[PDB]
Ligand binder design. Structure first.
Ligand SMILES: CCCCCOc1ccc2cc(S(=O)(=O)N[C@H](CCC(=O)O)C(=O)O)ccc2c1
Length: 429
């Protein structure tokens, strides 16, 4: 696309907003940026020649623009963006800009849970194939920063928000791993609207990879599943493709059924992208996992401290608990911005005499209510931890898998995960 002479407005700073700014400057276009936050991240890294309006949106800027580039963090339903859409002003995201430029095939991955793992695995599978691959998007580097014509493959994680402003994506392989309640604060029309956003990822996709165990992930598409699907499991556990064994999961550093289904999805995607299977399977044996994604940060004195800060929704926390083995007592930490999510689904995993809940952040109270007889409620996570540490016995597990966003008290789930690791080392000895 050609943006010359166009009046461009970017909504939202941070790394993404900056990646968008650099995108236009390099192309000889000076955009204006606005952020509803008084001091958005990156503000000081923004070139002085770039006009900025913070602390709110500027409708005079918005209605005068030829192109509005909206951060996934602002809803198209916002009246200001809504008025501009009515006026016929074109609105896009960074992912849209990226798609219009990319000169390599794109593997697009989305889903309520497992997208970063799968996106990282496909990245890993391309590296083992000797493919110059750009991995990023909703994780790692913002898509616009991955743009290089020497790049031979792009692997992008895409959120429902990003997909909402994208229309030019023609993925060589795309998937929705699953759809479970999340982001309801941004989807006033319920689960189906949320799903509708994710389904956009299949539009123009050369191959669609669906989850045979989750009907919501379906728009033929190649499928993956536990007991069924083109890519499925076999029980010792094996990853099978159309009846043929391809990998005994004991060769994987990752465990858990959902991580095995992740392996199948990554494989299905890698295959569709033409990546050599041998090297893709090798990558499945070398990947160790993502930080904050069910990460043991300390295992000392018979006690495991696991950092699953990346569990920012009920489905995710549920994955950590379903089948979880604990010798003694599970001290589970929940809390933050639950985003109006129904927490009930967790309750069935919260019975027995070996559970303790330590609920904090904005929705702490609501989280304690799952089983008030075994729950404590503090304001912060550090209080929750200094509260549980004394009660930790050999055989116990301290699990931070909050089922919520951390944006209410933290910059991001990584900050919350890192604070948990520091505290655990402190109290774990
Ligand atoms: C100009 C508008 C600026 C709005 C604030 O900036 C934002 C940019 C991107 C976001 C992504 C998302 S998000 O929803 O895609 N990611 C959060 C991560 C939670 C956590 O890390 O604990 C979530 O999944 O709940 C939420 C809010 C965002 C706000």
């Amino acid at each position: 696309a050609d943006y010359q002479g166009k009046n461009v407005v970017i909504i939202g700073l941070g790394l993404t907003g900056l990646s968008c700014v650099d995108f236009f400057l390099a192309r000889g276009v000076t955009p204006r940026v606005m952020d509803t936050r008084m001091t958005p991240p990156g503000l000081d890294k923004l070139p002085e020649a770039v006009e900025r309006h913070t602390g709110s949106l500027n409708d005079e800027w918005l209605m005068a623009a030829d192109l509005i580039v909206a951060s996934p963090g602002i809803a198209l339903a916002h009246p200001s963006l809504s008025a501009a859409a009515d006026a016929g002003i074109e609105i896009v995201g960074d992912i849209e800009l990226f798609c219009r430029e990319a000169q390599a095939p794109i593997v697009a991955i989305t889903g309520s849970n497992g997208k970063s793992t799968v996106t990282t695995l496909v990245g890993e599978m391309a590296k083992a194939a000797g493919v110059n691959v750009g991995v990023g998007g909703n994780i790692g580097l913002p898509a616009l920063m991955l743009l290089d014509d020497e790049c031979e493959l792009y692997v992008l994680e895409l959120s429902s928000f990003q997909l909402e402003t994208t229309s030019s994506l023609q993925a060589v392989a795309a998937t929705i791993l699953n759809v479970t309640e999340d982001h309801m604060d941004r989807y006033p029309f319920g689960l189906q609207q949320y799903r509708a956003a994710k389904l956009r990822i299949y539009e123009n996709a050369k191959v669609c990879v669906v989850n045979a165990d989750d009907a919501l992930t379906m728009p033929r598409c190649v499928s993956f599943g536990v007991n069924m699907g083109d890519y499925h499991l076999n029980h010792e556990t094996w990853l099978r493709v159309k009846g043929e064994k391809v990998l005994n999961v004991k060769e994987m550093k990752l465990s858990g059924q959902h991580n095995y289904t992740n392996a199948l999805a990554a494989l299905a995607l890698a295959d569709a992208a033409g990546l050599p299977r041998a090297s893709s399977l090798k990558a499945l044996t070398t990947f160790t996992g993502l930080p904050h994604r069910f990460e043991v940060v300390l295992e000392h004195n018979g006690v495991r401290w696991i950092n699953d800060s990346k569990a920012t929704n009920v489905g995710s926390t549920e994955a950590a608990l379903n089948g979880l083995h604990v010798d003694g007592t599970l001290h589970l930490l929940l809390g933050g911005d639950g985003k109006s999510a129904d927490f009930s689904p967790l309750a069935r995993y919260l019975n027995g005499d070996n559970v303790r809940l330590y609920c904090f952040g904005r929705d702490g109270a609501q989280l304690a209510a799952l089983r008030p007889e075994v729950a404590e409620q503090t304001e912060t996570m550090e209080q929750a931890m200094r509260l549980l540490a004394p009660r930790v016995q050999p055989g116990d597990m301290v699990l931070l898998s909050p089922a919520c966003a951390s944006l209410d008290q933290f910059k991001n789930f990584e900050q919350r995960g890192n604070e948990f690791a520091r505290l655990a080392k402190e109290l774990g000895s």
